Amino acid sequence: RSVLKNTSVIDKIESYVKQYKPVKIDASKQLQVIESFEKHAMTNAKETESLVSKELKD
Amino acid sequence: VRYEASLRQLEQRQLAKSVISRVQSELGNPKFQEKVLQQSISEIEQLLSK
Amino acid sequence: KAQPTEVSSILEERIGVSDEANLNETGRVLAVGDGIARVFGLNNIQAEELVEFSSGVKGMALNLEPGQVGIVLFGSDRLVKEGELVKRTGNIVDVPVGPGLLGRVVDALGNPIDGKGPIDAAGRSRAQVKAPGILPRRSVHEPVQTGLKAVDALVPIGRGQRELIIGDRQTGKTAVALDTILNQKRWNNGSDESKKLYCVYVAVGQKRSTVAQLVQTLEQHDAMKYSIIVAATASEAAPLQYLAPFTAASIGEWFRDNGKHALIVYDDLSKQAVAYRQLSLLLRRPPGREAYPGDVFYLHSRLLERAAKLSEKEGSGSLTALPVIETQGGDVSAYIPTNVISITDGQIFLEAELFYKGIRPAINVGLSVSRVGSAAQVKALKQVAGSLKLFLAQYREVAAFAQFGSDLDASTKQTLVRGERLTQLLKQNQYSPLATEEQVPLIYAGVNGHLDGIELSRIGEFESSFLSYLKSNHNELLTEIREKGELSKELLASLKSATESFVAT
Ligand SMILES: Nc1ncnc2c1ncn2[C@@H]1O[C@H](COP(=O)(O)OP(=O)(O)OP(=O)(O)O)[C@@H](O)[C@H]1O
């Protein structure tokens, strides 16, 4: 800022950045469809696991 | 900051053509006459140093 | 503002010098034609003393005679007029040295052309300083990490190892030392001065637009905070182009004698030889081979001898030199380069055909070599590139052998495929230096044949892919290569696993 001796905007853009210093929050939105994806995952996985654990000894 | 340095350089070149204006101010004087005595007393000062 | 008039008026106060202006030098100019001037008088002049003419142009009094003294000009003869008044400085030709020279762009005399005001000089130093003797030296033992692939792989550079870059016109020569300077940003951002390495680029006889774009580019990548540019462009006088590399060598000596480490880059000595034979022919001195005066070997000799590694008694300073020689059509038997080859500690030949094939850098490995670089290679690179030059010379043997279309055994075809992969490997775009930690895994993949199943065109994306792979994941191994510079067996096997993982894709 003190490099520009003709400052005139640096307070403006500095308080503009400090204004938007709370930029935007993130997106932790998925907690319902993602658990359905891993629900189908655990479903078909335990189907496969029980079937192969049976058929190996079979 | 780029425009600041640009404005400094424009100030410097406008003072260069102002140096031209100062030279044209200095040209028409009896400083041409008086300054001979300047050299006189000066050369006295230089050669009296030794 | 008026603060420039304030500073200039303090300089007007200095302009105090008029109160003690009894110069024991002033003499009339007898004649002044063909870039030279005979001056009567100056009977207490010194040999190779800087003088200044009445038209502001300075000059060096080079030959002394009973009756007159022949003084060369440092500019056009259009300013110097016959019969004028020639004040001597009182000095052998000296240039400003100091840390404030960094960032600035000057002439051959340290007068800045960047328009950034005066120079914060820490002193003045002579141009024709003696090179240091054999005792305050040390054999090189510290690397110069250029950031390029095949350069740091095959021709390592010691701090002070005088390595020639030789090539032809528009053959990527300037970009090599340019990207070397850009690699030095790694440690110039750092803090250890012995890790730091300061850059002086000497553009002589070239286009002012070219130098302006180069300085612009060095400001874009922010190399300017450790850069010093010496401009001796083609519009300027031949003695300026003669003189400027000696001045930059004095700057490098200023850095070296402060214990620090510094890099100078000459570009090019070829035009300096042109300027020097222009001088000597206007000195009416007889030429020798290819119309050069016979001392032109001594010229570049006495230039490049002022660059070495100081011992610990001197503070372990170093000064590494990168001369550039433009040849004519790939000739290595012209009189000028064969002199330089007899001086430097090795060669970096750039083949025109490889860059004509777009292979940038266009390194001919079979010609390019360093003599004592292996003593100061990075120890990990010394571990991993032992078979590499052997395998590349081997692939070069079957390079011209495979042009006949004859099928071969799996051994020579294996070397053919892997050498094709290594050849297409070592391309590298401009302004893209690579750290040593980045260069190690590409070599380790290239040695162990993992590239052979990969497509030849796929290698370029594979490089960046595997690098981003490791930087994402095996960042610890990158830090290990950074900290050690040397691969243990555990690091070797972990490196092997980390490679073969991404080699599975
Ligand atoms: N690794 C690279 N990536 C991109 N471009 C490159 C690379 N190497 C060389 N070039 C190209 O080569 C051209 C010549 O560059 P350079 O000036 O270094 O060659 P040169 O032989 O030094 O020419 P001169 O001697 O006239 O300066 C440039 O236009 C540049 O784009």
> Based on the domain organization, do C386 and C343 belong to the same domain?
no
C477 close to C483: Cβ distance less than 8 angstroms? no
Residue where a domain terminates, one of C28, C61, C91: C91
Residue where a domain terminates, one of C312, C345, C377: C377
User: Does C217 fall in a domain?
Assistant: yes
User: Does C14 fall in a domain?
Assistant: no
Give CA–CA dist C119/C42, Å, rounded. Answer: 30
> Of C211, C349, C430, C463, which is best to mutate to test ligand 1, by the most ligand atoms within 8 angstroms of its C-beta?
C430
Structural tokens at position C76: 């056009």
How many domains in chain C?
A: 3
CATH code for the domain in which residue C32 is found: 2.40.30.20
Q: At what angle do helices C436-447 and C475-484 cross, to 10 degrees?
A: 110
- In ligand 1, which atom is closest to the CA atom of C268? 25
- Please indicate whether residue C429, judged by its CB atom, sits closer than 6 Å to ligand 1: yes
CATH code for the domain in which residue C479 is found: 1.20.150.20
> Based on the domain organization, do C314 and C460 belong to the same domain?
no
- Please indicate whether residue C270, judged by its CB atom, sits closer than 6 Å to ligand 1: no
Q: Can you say which residues of C are annotated as belonging to the binding site for ATP?
A: 167-174
> Based on the domain organization, do C182 and C295 belong to the same domain?
yes
* Cα B21 to Cα B17, B29, B35, distances in angstroms: 6, 14, 20
Cis geometry, peptide bond prior to residue C361 (ω within 30 degrees of 0)? yes
User: Does C324 fall in a domain?
Assistant: yes
User: Does C9 fall in a domain?
Assistant: no
Cβ-based contacts of A6 with chain B (< 8 Å): 4, 7
Give CA–CA dist C159/C139, Å, rounded. Answer: 9
C378 close to C436: Cβ distance less than 8 angstroms? yes
> Based on the domain organization, do C252 and C225 belong to the same domain?
yes
Cβ-based contacts of B7 with chain A (< 8 Å): 6
C41 close to C26: Cβ distance less than 8 angstroms? yes
Determine what percent of chain A falls in helix, strand and coil, rounding each to the nearest 5.
60, 0, 40
Experimental method of this PDB entry: cryo-EM
Instruction: Please report, as a single letter, which amino acid is at residue C82.
Output: E
* Residue A3 sits at the chain B interface (C-beta within 8 Å): yes
Report DSSP state, residue C23.
-
Cβ-based contacts of B15 with chain C (< 8 Å): 4-5
Reported structure resolution in angstroms:
3.6
> Based on the domain organization, do C283 and C230 belong to the same domain?
yes
Residue of B nearest to A4 (CA): B1
Instruction: Look up the domain containing C111 and give its range.
Output: 92-377
C303 sits in which H/E element: helix C296-304
User: Does C13 fall in a domain?
Assistant: no
> Based on the domain organization, do C326 and C450 belong to the same domain?
no
Phi, psi (5° rounding) for residue C161? -80, 120
User: Does C5 fall in a domain?
Assistant: no
Rounded to the nearest angstrom, the distance between the alpha carbon of C177 and the centre of ligand 1 is: 11
State the catalytic residues of C: 371
Rounded to the nearest angstrom, the distance between the alpha carbon of C170 and the centre of ligand 1 is: 6
> Based on the domain organization, do C428 and C459 belong to the same domain?
yes
* Residue B2 sits at the chain C interface (C-beta within 8 Å): no
Q: In this structure, which long-range contacts are made by residues C448-452, counting pairs with CB atoms below 8 Å and at least 24 apart in sequence? A: C448/C496, C448/C499, C449/C414, C449/C418, C450/C499, C450/C500, C450/C503, C451/C418, C451/C421, C451/C422, C451/C425, C452/C414, C452/C417, C452/C418, C452/C421
- Please indicate whether residue C171, judged by its CB atom, sits closer than 6 Å to ligand 1: yes
Residue where a domain terminates, one of C91, C109, C126: C91
> Based on the domain organization, do C236 and C321 belong to the same domain?
yes
* Residue B4 sits at the chain A interface (C-beta within 8 Å): yes
User: Does C460 fall in a domain?
Assistant: yes
> Based on the domain organization, do C449 and C364 belong to the same domain?
no
**Closest in B8, B9, B45 to C19, CB measured:** B45
C349 close to C368: Cβ distance less than 8 angstroms? yes
- Please indicate whether residue C234, judged by its CB atom, sits closer than 6 Å to ligand 1: no
User: Does C291 fall in a domain?
Assistant: yes
Nearest CA to ligand 1 atom 11: C172
Rounded to the nearest angstrom, the distance between the alpha carbon of C362 and the centre of ligand 1 is: 10
